[PDB]
Ligand binder design. Structure first.
Ligand SMILES: CC(=O)N[C@@H]1[C@@H](O[C@@H]2O[C@H](CO)[C@H](O)[C@H](O)[C@H]2O)[C@H](O[C@@H]2O[C@@H](C)[C@@H](O)[C@@H](O)[C@@H]2O)[C@@H](CO)O[C@@H]1O
Ligand SMILES: CC(=O)N[C@@H]1[C@@H](O[C@@H]2O[C@H](CO)[C@H](O)[C@H](O)[C@H]2O)[C@H](O[C@@H]2O[C@@H](C)[C@@H](O)[C@@H](O)[C@@H]2O)[C@@H](CO)O[C@H]1O
Lengths: 306, 307
């Protein structure tokens, strides 16, 4: 059958699948107190996209649609009636948690809303700084609408609009919680069509994440976002569609200069990596190294500890 | 063991512009009289050699990274940004590049948001300034390692590590958007260096076929159009595959995979751009399910059926 492969891309050549930013660290953690169930950056090793995952970096935490008329709400002064980022009409009966690329954390996403060109406006006339909070009860993307909180400039009513994400905001009552899913249809309604939760299934193992330090626009602290596989892997697996020969592919992080293995890991067919490690640490790698497919193994392959 | 050349299986709605971070909206053709088509982003030879300021990530296209320094007291560029490459690698002007990777490659105002040191302020959007980066500014000298920032929303902080995230294009009274005019990467007294070569049809009768995006227009009255030679996914694909080019021209077919039918043929030049036998400025309509498929290697003289 068609051989499974990983793209030859170093850590500085990878993009986060859950926020449009370069990967800057590998990271591991027990995450004891959380269900790790992201919806972006979800794709099986044989190329099946899941959750809200799609192929473009530009659609991740992006939104597109028609703005409403003004609301009475102090925070969400306008609603956005969603379409998919590729422009396709969105039907809530679709097999998805929400439109593709929808943010998959509880917290405040910051970015810029652009709408109808403004012939007469001054500088930045058609670019509004906007907060999209996934703890708002107006955050109901499954139903086809989310709330917009303007923070710089003024949102125009009833216009075709685009939201380009820039960063994360944290205010007094909205911590950034990357492993808590939004309520895609609002509180007291169940989420649907989710990519499954992930985690280790062999003693002494933890998930290894691809991590990005992303812009922090309010709150004062650095913000970290972990994805299970980078966007380029999503793209690669979708292109290749190599049949998975077992539940686990043994991969090695290799230094191409020396041919030496920095460490080995298990890449599960569902699309996440586990390593033999304990505790919350970065995993240090040579800038020129990258994962290489070694062989198909099983869930009991005993990894060399890090 | 000869690696065959291929194109990725991605329809028009699954492609990204290689000159601005936005999805491809249309295929578009033009004679482009009066201009030199010599973009520096989205440049990659069919055998996988990145050229100009081209790199691999969508997120680095038209992005900047570096340190601001002190206030310039200048009217427009109130701060300067001292650049490193988008991946954080230190940049040295003697590198064989036109400018740091991802540097904008048109003459116009690029608008986006500068984020810096997280701030103590409790203000919303405290650490996020709307900024204009004009590639016609005398302070736009990325080859020399520095560009000018013109704040338009908020205040830029001095002496801080900074990221510019692109959002769109601005047009004001004296800075029209000219997608095919190159910045002077070292200022107007100095030649550009290390450029990916200009491109065009070898013969009258042919025109370049572009992958086109409508991108946000944050000031000015018109929608903004940006054309690239190949989409970012092709840059990435050729880089990965590194299939040797067997002649100067790869004959390709826009096919509908559902029916097997060829919509049109085209010439994919080894330099990394497409020509078709066409005349006039027009979109080229394709089926949503379709995509280019490699056919065979041919020569410069291959005569396409005129559209
Ligand atoms: C800045 C601030 O503290 N505003 C609170 C407000 O909290 C905000 O509510 C928004 C939605 O309307 C977003 O959820 C923001 O992230 C959040 O900061 C708060 O609103 C209440 O609390 C939140 C979590 C939502 O559950 C709301 O539905 C809810 O009404 C109100 C009321 O407590 O006070 C301030 O306005
Ligand atoms: C808002 C405005 O029109 N300012 C005028 C200058 O144009 C801007 O200059 C900055 C750089 O300082 C930048 O290029 C912007 O894109 C312009 O809008 C103008 O500068 C002169 O004209 C520019 C196009 C540019 O070539 C620059 O190098 C040149 O000095 C000056 C001078 O006429 O006047 C300002 O009112």
């Amino acid at each position: 059958t068609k051989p499974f492969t990983l793209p030859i891309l170093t850590i500085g050549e990878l993009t986060n699948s859950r926020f449009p930013a370069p990967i800057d660290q590998l990271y591991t953690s027990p995450n004891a107190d959380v269900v790790v169930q992201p919806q972006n950056g979800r794709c099986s090793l044989d190329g099946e996209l899941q959750g809200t995952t799609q192929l473009l970096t530009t659609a991740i935490c992006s939104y597109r649609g028609m703005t409403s008329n003004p609301t009475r709400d102090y925070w969400d002064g306008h609603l956005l009636h969603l379409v998919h980022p590729n422009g396709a009409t969105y039907d809530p009966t679709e097999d998805v948690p929400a439109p593709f690329g929808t943010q998959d954390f509880r917290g405040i996403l910051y970015g810029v809303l652009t709408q109808n060109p403004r012939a007469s406006g001054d500088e930045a006339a058609n670019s509004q700084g906007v907060y999209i909070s996934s703890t708002s009860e107006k955050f109901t993307p499954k139903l086809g609408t989310i709330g917009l909180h303007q923070v710089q400039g003024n949102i125009a009513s009833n216009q075709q609009s685009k939201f380009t994400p820039v960063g994360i905001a944290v205010n007094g009552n909205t911590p950034f919680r990357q492993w808590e899913l939004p309520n895609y249809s609002g509180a007291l309604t169940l989420n649907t069509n989710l990519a499954p939760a992930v985690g280790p299934n062999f003693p002494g193992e933890q998930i290894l994440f691809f991590r990005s330090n992303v812009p922090s626009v309010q709150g004062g602290q650095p913000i970290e976002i972990d994805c299970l596989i980078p966007q380029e892997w999503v793209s690669h697996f979708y292109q290749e569609s190599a049949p998975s020969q077992s539940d686990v592919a043994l991969v090695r992080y290799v230094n191409p200069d020396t041919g030496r293995t920095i460490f080995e890991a298990k890449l599960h067919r569902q699309g996440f990596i586990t390593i033999a490690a304990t505790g919350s640490n970065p995993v240090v790698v040579p800038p020129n190294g990258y994962f290489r497919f070694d062989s198909w193994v099983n869930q009991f392959y005993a990894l060399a500890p890090m």
